[PDB]
C-alpha cells in the first residue's frame, strides 16, 4: 500500500520514469489553479485525473497504462492535490504498478512547465462561473463576451436547464440543405447581428454534445469572430459541477447590426471540394478523415440518408469514435479533450503533422469541427474544415473512393 | 430464444474494454505472436486478446474446448469479441456457441491501430512453414536472415524418418553430436567447434532448426546459441506443421555439406546461457532469481524419477515448478493443439504463479536438459533477458546424495 521514496523531476528523468499529473485536464492543459499560479504540467507528464477513475474499468486503465508505455517496474511519480494523488496511487497499485512515488518538487518552477498553446480556448466550468460573478480570472475576455448553447433544432433541453445568461443557437441557423454546408455569408451576417455578436465579442460556446458547439464555433471563426471558445466537455461538465442554472426560453437579445469587419474575415478556414482534393498525396498537406473505422473501410456510410459507402481515397485517418455521432477517440472519460500529446501521436502515426496544411472532414462537418477546434487550441497554424465531406464527395461517382482495411502507408 | 437469430452487435476495442470483455484472435498463433500477414503489415494481437485459432478446432474435443474456456475464465455471459478472417471467425463462433457462450460479437476495429498491438518481443525466432517456404523460393519475408542460412532437422540417432521425408534443403544433425555420456551434458567446446565446422555454420550463419519433437531442436539450438551462433531459430511446432501444410518435401540421405572451418569468434561466445551445478545452486532461495524445474508434476513431487536410468526420485530443494507436461517425454503445458508454442500471456501467468518472473535471473532444468531447452527458447522469444539452462539437471544434482532434495505436494511458498 505505501508510496516508494519521493523523487524530484531530475531524479525521475535520470531513472527513466514518468510523471503523472492527477489534476483535471483543464489544469494539466495550462489553466492555473489560482490566479497568477503555475500554468501547465511537468515536461512529458501524463494526465490521469483522479476524477476520471470511476469511469475507467479495469480494462480501460490497463489499456491506458499500455498506451502510455508505463513499464511495470519503472518509477512513476504522482503530483497534484493530495486526495487525488492517493486515489490514483491506489488504482495504479491494483493495476500492478510497483514503484509509485510522489514528485516532490512538482510545480515548484513555473518556467519549466508545458501547456496547450491556446488552453484559454478550452474553458472549464468554475472559470466560466467566476467570470460571470465578476471575479478576476486568467485570460479574461478583452471586452464583451457572450455564452451560447448550440444544438440541433428548437430549444428543448435548454428550456429545462442551461448555463446562466446563456443565449441559444439552433445549428440550422448556420448550416442547411442541400449539402449541410454552411449558409451564405449574407445569412451568417444576419445570424451574427441577431445574436448580438460583433467581430470583437468573445463567444463562449457549449453544447450537450461538444461537436454541435464546435460546428457553430468554426463557422463563426470563418465569418470573423476573433475570440471564440469552447466549454471543454460540454454541458455535462457544468451539470456535474453542480453550478447554478437558469431555465425557460432564451431572453431577448439586443441586435448588433454592425459586425465591424467584412464577412468572411477568415475564408481560408473552410475548403471546398477541389481545394480539399488538392491536399491529397502530399507530404506538406493532409486531408483528414474524422470518421469511424467502419465508415473509413466502407462497411457503412454512417448516415441514414447517405447511400454511398467508402472513403476519400488518400484521406489520412484522424480517428473519431464508434459511430457517426460519437467522438471517444478524442475524449477523456469525463468527455473533455484528451491530452495534446496523445492526439499529436495518434495523428503523427498517419503522417498528419502540424507543419502541414491540414483539413478535417467527416460526414457533414460536425466531427471535423470538433477536431478543428482542438487542433487550433493545440497551436496548429494551418487547419481548416472541408465542409462538404463524404456527403459531398460521394455525390460525384467520378471521385476516387477507397474501401477495405488499410494502414498509414496506404495514404501517401 | 434458443431459436433466436439476431447478430450480437459489433464492438470497438474501447467498448469491449469499458465492459471488461475478452477479445479472441482466431488467427494461427504465428500471427497472434507477431508475424505480420503482409510485409510491413500490423504485427501482433490486441491487448490481452486470447488466441483460439480456427485451425486448432478439429483437434479440440468438447472437454478440451471446455477446459480452455475455463482456463481463460470466459464467463458464460460477459462480452466476447472475435477477430481474424471470416471463415475462421465463423468456425470459432460456431464452436463457442455450441459450448454455450451467449454474447459473441465481432471486434469491429481489430488491427486498425498498429501501435497498440502486443507481440513476442522476438516472434521472429519462432518461424512457421509458409515463411520458410517463401524464404526458400526467393520471396520477400519479414525478418529475413541477414546473410547465409541453413535449415537443419535434429533428432536422436542416425537419420530414420528424415530418409522418408524432410524439409527441402534441410541438413540433419544427430543430437549425439552435441551431448554425450556420462551426464548427458553438452560436449566440450572443442567438439562443438568441430560439429559447427562440419555442418557449415559460422557465427553469422542463421540456423533454423526443427525436429519431429520440438525439444530435440531446442536442445541443439540452445547449445548453438551458447557456442556463439548469433541467429538461431526454431520451426514452431516442428516437422508436423510442415507436413500438415502439405508443402514440398525431399527424400534420402543428407546431402554433403561444405565444411566451414573458421567460426569467426571464440567459442563459446555466450557462456552465460549455460549454468553448471554451482551456478545453479547459487540461484536458490532468492526473490531476484529462480531455478526452474521443467518436469512433470509426478517428477516434481517424487512419485517417479521420470527416467529409466535415473534412480533417485524427488526435486532440487527450492526449485520452482515451471510446468512441463503429463510425463517426462511430453510438453502439453507449453503447446497448442497443433504442437505450436502456447500463448506467451498464459506461459507468463503460469510462471508468475510460481514466483518465476522476467526481472529475475532464471535458469531452466529438467532430467538432462531437453525440455529445459524448449522452455529456454520460448523465454528467449518472449524477450526474458537473463535466462539460461542448467545442463546437469536432476540427473547431475541427484547423483550426489549430499545435495538437498524436496519431495511431496507443495506450493510456491516452500521455494522461498
Ligand atoms: Na458540410
Ligand atoms: Na544435461
From Swiss-Prot, chain A:
GO MF terms, alphabetically ordered: sulfurtransferase activity; thiosulfate-cyanide sulfurtransferase activity
Record-linked InterPro entries: Rhodanese-like_dom, Rhodanese-like_dom_sf, Thiosulphate_STrfase_CS, TST/MPST-like
Active site: residue positions: 362
Reaction equation(s) it catalyzes: thiosulfate + hydrogen cyanide = thiocyanate + sulfite + 2 H(+)
Keyword Transmembrane helix in annotation: no
Gene3D superfamilies: Rhodanese-like domain
PROSITE patterns to which the protein is assigned, alphabetical: PROKAR_LIPOPROTEIN, RHODANESE_1, RHODANESE_2, RHODANESE_3
Gene Ontology CC: one annotated term: periplasmic space
Subunit comment: Monomer.
UniProt xrefs under PANTHER family: SULFURTRANSFERASE, THIOSULFATE SULFERTANSFERASE
Further remark: In vitro, YnjE can be efficiently persulfurated by the cysteine desulfurase IscS.
Protein's recorded name: Thiosulfate sulfurtransferase YnjE
Gene (name only): ynjE
Amino acid at each position: 500500500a505505501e508510496l516508494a521514496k519521493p523523487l524530484t523531476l531530475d531524479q525521475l528523468q535520470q531513472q527513466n520514469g514518468k510523471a503523472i499529473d492527477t489534476r483535471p485536464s483543464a489544469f494539466y492543459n495550462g489553466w492555473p489553479q489560482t490566479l497568477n499560479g503555475p500554468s501547465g504540467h511537468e515536461l512529458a507528464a501524463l494526465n490521469l485525473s483522479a476524477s476520471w477513475l470511476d469511469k475507467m474499468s479495469t480494462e480501460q486503465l490497463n489499456a491506458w497504462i499500455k498506451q502510455h508505455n508505463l513499464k511495470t517496474d519503472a518509477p512513476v511519480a504522482l503530483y497534484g492535490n493530495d486526495k487525488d494523488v492517493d486515489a490514483v496511487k491506489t488504482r495504479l497499485q491494483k493495476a500492478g504498478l510497483t514503484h509509485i512515488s510522489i514528485l516532490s518538487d512538482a510545480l515548484s518552477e513555473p518556467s519549466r512547465l508545458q501547456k496547450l498553446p491556446h488552453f484559454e480556448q478550452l474553458v472549464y466550468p468554475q472559470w466560466l462561473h467566476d467570470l460571470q460573478q465578476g471575479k478576476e480570472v486568467t485570460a479574461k475576455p478583452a471586452g464583451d463576451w457572450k455564452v451560447i448553447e448550440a444544438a440541433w433544432g428548437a430549444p428543448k433541453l435548454y428550456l429545462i436547464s442551461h448555463i446562466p445568461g446563456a443565449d441559444y443557437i439552433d445549428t440550422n441557423e448556420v448550416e442547411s440543405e442541400p449539402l449541410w454546408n454552411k449558409v451564405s455569408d449574407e445569412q451568417l451576417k444576419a445570424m451574427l447581428a441577431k445574436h448580438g455578436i460583433r467581430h470583437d465579442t468573445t463567444v463562449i460556446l457549449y453544447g450537450r454534445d461538444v461537436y454541435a458547439a464546435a460546428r457553430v464555433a468554426q463557422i463563426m471563426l470563418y465569418a470573423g469572430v476573433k475570440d471564440v471558445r469552447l466549454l471543454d466537455g460540454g454541458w455535462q461538465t457544468w451539470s456535474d459541477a453542480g453550478l447554478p442554472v437558469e431555465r425557460g426560453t432564451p431572453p431577448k437579445v439586443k441586435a448588433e447590426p454592425d459586425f465591424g469587419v467584412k464577412i468572411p474575415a477568415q475564408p481560408q478556414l473552410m475548403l471546398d471540394m477541389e481545394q480539399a482534393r488538392g491536399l491529397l498525396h502530399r507530404q506538406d498537406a493532409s486531408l483528414v478523415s474524422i470518421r469511424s473505422w467502419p465508415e473509413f473501410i466502407g462497411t457503412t456510410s454512417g448516415y441514414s440518408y447517405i447511400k454511398p459507402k467508402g472513403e476519400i481515397a488518400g484521406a489520412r485517418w484522424g480517428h473519431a469514435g464508434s459511430d457517426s455521432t460519437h467522438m471517444e477517440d478524442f475524449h477523456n472519460p469525463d468527455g473533455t479533450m484528451r491530452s495534446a500529446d496523445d492526439i499529436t501521436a495518434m495523428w503523427k502515426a498517419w503522417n498528419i503533422k502540424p507543419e502541414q496544411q491540414v483539413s478535417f472532414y467527416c460526414g457533414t462537418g460536425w466531427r471535423a469541427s470538433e477536431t478543428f477546434m482542438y487542433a487550433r487550441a493545440m497551436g496548429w497554424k494551418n487547419v481548416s474544415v472541408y465542409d462538404g465531406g463524404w456527403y459531398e464527395w460521394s455525390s460525384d461517382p467520378k471521385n476516387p473512393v477507397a474501401t477495405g482495411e488499410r494502414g498509414p502507408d496506404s495514404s501517401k
